[PDB]
Amino acid sequence: MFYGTVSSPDSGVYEMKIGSIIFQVASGDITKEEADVIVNSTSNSFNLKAGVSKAILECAGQNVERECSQQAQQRKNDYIITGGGFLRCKNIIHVIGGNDVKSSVSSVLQECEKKNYSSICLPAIGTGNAKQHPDKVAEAIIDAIEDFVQKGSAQSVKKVKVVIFLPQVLDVFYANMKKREG
């Protein structure tokens, strides 16, 4: 009902259409990416510096660290939105790695539509210190996008890219895309 064909538009990049959205996966350093939103997979205190979260907070800078700790004390948050600091983005959305991944990605998509944003870049949420299994994480990320498209919610969002630290985890995402393709 929604899925296009898997292909490689550039060396090390794999893509398929999901309704009006281009979904892409690649391995590399997410802190070098440019997008309207970059997602950080962190702890329930929004102050983890282990796995990909270490690089994201180091590169974003101390003003972003302070935004995180101020919001964390204000109320009980499932996720928080901060400035981009010294990353190449308009906002960082910090999600909890241990939470349900489909729910976290659904929230990111909704928040990006609220800001009229077009591009998102995320890591393999939950596969760091939270130790969720990579095939369950790939299934959840792609399911969230399918549901968002099915409900007619994609208007401003046009591109969702997963940049993945470990090549072995990229292989799991690519196999999940091939399972779904038209």
Ligand X SMILES: N#CCC(=O)NC1CCCCC1
29 annotated binding-site participant:
yes
The entry of ligand X, Cl ion, none near residue 64 (CB within 5 to 8 angstroms by kind) is none
- Position 124 contacts Cl ion (CB under 5 A): yes
The entry of Cl ion, ligand X, none near residue 130 (CB within 5 to 8 angstroms by kind) is Cl ion
- Position 144 contacts Cl ion (CB under 5 A): no
35 annotated binding-site participant:
no
Contact 111, 146 (CB under 8 A): no
Contacts of ligand X in 3-32 (CB under 6 A): none
Please tell me the distance from the alpha carbon of residue 25 to that of residue 142, in angstroms, as a whole number.
Answer: 11
- Position 128 contacts Cl ion (CB under 5 A): yes
129 annotated binding-site participant:
yes
* Least spacing, CB of residue 128 vs Cl ion, in Å: 3
117 three-state secondary structure: coil
Nearest to 55, CA basis, from 77, 79, 38: 38
> Exactly one of 96, 128, 132, 149 binds ligand X (CB under 6 A); which one?
128
Contacts of ligand X in 96-125 (CB under 6 A): 123-125
> Exactly one of 165, 171, 174, 180 binds ligand X (CB under 6 A); which one?
165
What crossing angle do the helices spanning 167-180 and 134-150 adopt, rounded to 10°?
40
Side by side, the strands of the sheet bearing 13-18 are 7-10, 13-18, 21-27, 159-164, 119-122, 37-42, 91-96, 79-83
Please tell me the distance from the alpha carbon of residue 105 to that of residue 42, in angstroms, as a whole number.
Answer: 14
Please tell me the distance from the alpha carbon of residue 157 to that of residue 160, in angstroms, as a whole number.
Answer: 8
Burial 150-160 (b: 16+ CB within 10 A, else e): eeeebeebebb
* Least spacing, CB of residue 162 vs ligand X, in Å: 10
* Least spacing, CB of residue 70 vs ligand X, in Å: 23
Q: Please give the residue ranges that form the binding site for Cl ion (CB under 5 A).
A: 41, 97, 123-124, 128, 130, 164-165
Extract the annotated binding site for a glycoprotein.
29-30, 41, 52, 126-130, 165
